[PDB]
Design a protein around this motif. Structure first.
Motif, PDB file in Angstrom:
ATOM      1  N   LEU B 148       0.796  -1.175   0.119  1.00  0.00           N
ATOM      2  CA  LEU B 148       0.086  -0.114  -0.167  1.00  0.00           C
ATOM      3  C   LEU B 148       0.939   1.261   0.028  1.00  0.00           C
ATOM      4  N   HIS B 149       0.637   2.071  -1.028  1.00  0.00           N
ATOM      5  CA  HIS B 149       1.426   3.365  -1.014  1.00  0.00           C
ATOM      6  C   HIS B 149       0.893   4.354  -1.918  1.00  0.00           C
ATOM      7  N   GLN B 150       1.201   5.629  -1.927  1.00  0.00           N
ATOM      8  CA  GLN B 150       0.766   6.878  -2.639  1.00  0.00           C
ATOM      9  C   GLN B 150       1.926   7.172  -3.977  1.00  0.00           C
ATOM     10  N   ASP B 151       1.603   7.630  -5.003  1.00  0.00           N
ATOM     11  CA  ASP B 151       2.478   8.224  -5.974  1.00  0.00           C
ATOM     12  C   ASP B 151       1.986   9.824  -5.994  1.00  0.00           C
ATOM     13  N   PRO B 152       3.151  10.557  -6.582  1.00  0.00           N
ATOM     14  CA  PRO B 152       2.813  12.053  -6.331  1.00  0.00           C
ATOM     15  C   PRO B 152       2.028  12.418  -7.855  1.00  0.00           C
ATOM     16  N   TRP B 221      -4.172   5.781  -2.178  1.00  0.00           N
ATOM     17  CA  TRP B 221      -3.112   4.679  -1.658  1.00  0.00           C
ATOM     18  C   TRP B 221      -3.770   3.478  -2.481  1.00  0.00           C
ATOM     19  N   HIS B 222      -2.746   2.777  -2.996  1.00  0.00           N
ATOM     20  CA  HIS B 222      -3.094   1.471  -3.688  1.00  0.00           C
ATOM     21  C   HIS B 222      -2.122   0.273  -3.425  1.00  0.00           C
ATOM     22  N   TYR B 223      -2.780  -0.901  -3.186  1.00  0.00           N
ATOM     23  CA  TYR B 223      -1.972  -2.036  -3.050  1.00  0.00           C
ATOM     24  C   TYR B 223      -2.561  -2.815  -4.105  1.00  0.00           C
TER      25      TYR B 223
HETATM   26 NI    NI Z   1       1.881   3.058  -7.243  1.00  0.00          NI
END
Ligand code: NI
Ligand SMILES: O=C(O)CCC(=O)C(=O)O
Ligand SMILES: O=C(O)CCC(=O)C(=O)O
Ligand code: NI
Lengths: 230, 238
Positions: B148-152, B221-223
């Motif tokens: 799970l993370h975010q990108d700018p 947020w995506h996993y």
């Molecule tokens: Ni990503």
């Protein structure tokens, strides 16, 4: 020496009637010099695209079947051992259909329009790679089809004998004579045999008529592509 | 290696070729995820990029390959190898460990591949310039996991080969995700006791299939877990 004639983009008719039908050699200019291979092929490009690929490599003189041999190795291994660092022995990536094996490279070449003059179909044209260091030598020989020999990297010295002169060529399809170091004693008839010669440079195509005798030494690090057609 | 039960979770909505205007007003501006159908499904890569095709064209190129999961810097590492050695060690037959050709600009490296994809029309809705779009390849066996993370930037993730289970949490839900930007929570095996606020956080999810495009809004947020041998292409744009 007597030089092979050079023509810029001769018509199809003229090529047929003055070179194809009568079996006379010629160099074609302005035909292949803009194929993508002319600007794209270099040691680094070849290693990047095909370095990991496995190819057959000749070592030795092709005068006698027993006198030469092939070993399989990657393109990178061949360049490392036989081109770059720092060849004691001579290796040649010769007479290999690299372009069926590696369709990415085939995109960098093209089938000469003149091939449509033959009887056979396009799919039946055999395209071989000839990739090697300065100093590779293909002994005098003949081939059973027409040939367009396309020079891509470096230059070759090429000597050509009409089939009319087979007799003075002391055959064994391949001549017994070392064209550049002939034994005048063992084969007297040779030295006065007439011939045509040339230095084939990048972008240039040599048409070698069917059965025409040819000898070939690379003057530089070299890459050529032949099209055997009928 | 289990296909999750997505019909029991809130699903990302699917639209067939929504108009630019509908996409702008209802998804881009408010930052809502959507799956675009009928946009990429006829891109040549869809039929062209078999495993054997990828190996033939790209086999010799050296590419960065991730091992370990990216929950922290020290927990993963990259090895540079050829595509052939990647496929050989991490894809074919029975590989022992998981390797992932992740987040690599294969299309700048092998420009011919660009002919088999396109910049989605919807990208023209952003401020950025088409040349500034960043296109990445994600090529890996069944079982790769991107935590799970975010990108700018905004993202169109295009699925080409295989399926991925994807779970999405809006930026307004960061609190319940325990950032260290990346989350400390393992989405599919969360530690309820250590991360109590996670179980009730709302999310959308989906199984993304070949030909489908997932719009991941900037900072959403995506996993992601690959369900089969998988190949995806992302377009980070603004
Ligand atoms: Ni990503
Ligand atoms: O280029 C060479 O070394 C030999 C060429 C040849 O014999 C051919 O293409 O038929
Ligand atoms: O496909 C994956 O495994 C991760 C994709 C991703 O995080 C992205 O495109 O931003
Ligand atoms: Ni020959």
């Amino acid at each position: 020496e007597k030089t092979v004639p050079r023509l810029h983009r001769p018509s199809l008719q003229h090529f047929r009637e003055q070179f194809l039908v009568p079996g006379r050699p010629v160099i074609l200019k302005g035909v292949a010099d803009h194929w993508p291979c002319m600007q794209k092929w270099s040691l680094e490009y070849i290693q990047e695209i095909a370095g990991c690929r496995t190819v057959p490599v000749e070592v030795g003189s092709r005068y006698t079947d027993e006198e030469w041999s092939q070993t399989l190795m990657t393109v990178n291994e061949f360049i490392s051992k036989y081109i770059v660092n720092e060849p004691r022995d001579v290796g040649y990536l010769a007479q290999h259909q690299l372009f069926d094996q590696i369709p990415e490279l085939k995109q960098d070449i093209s089938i000469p329009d003149y091939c449509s003059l033959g009887d056979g179909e396009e799919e039946e044209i055999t395209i071989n790679a000839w990739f090697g260091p300065q100093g590779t030598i293909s002994p005098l020989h003949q081939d059973p089809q027409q040939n367009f020999l396309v020079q891509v990297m470096g230059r070759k010295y090429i000597r050509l004998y009409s089939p009319q002169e087979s007799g003075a060529l002391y055959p064994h399809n391949t001549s017994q004579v070392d064209v550049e170091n002939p034994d005048l004693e063992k084969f007297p008839k040779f030295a006065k045999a007439p011939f045509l010669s040339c230095i084939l440079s990048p972008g240039e195509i040599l048409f070698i008529p069917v059965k025409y005798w040819h000898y070939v030494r690379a003057l530089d690090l070299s890459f050529s592509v032949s099209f055997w057609w009928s």
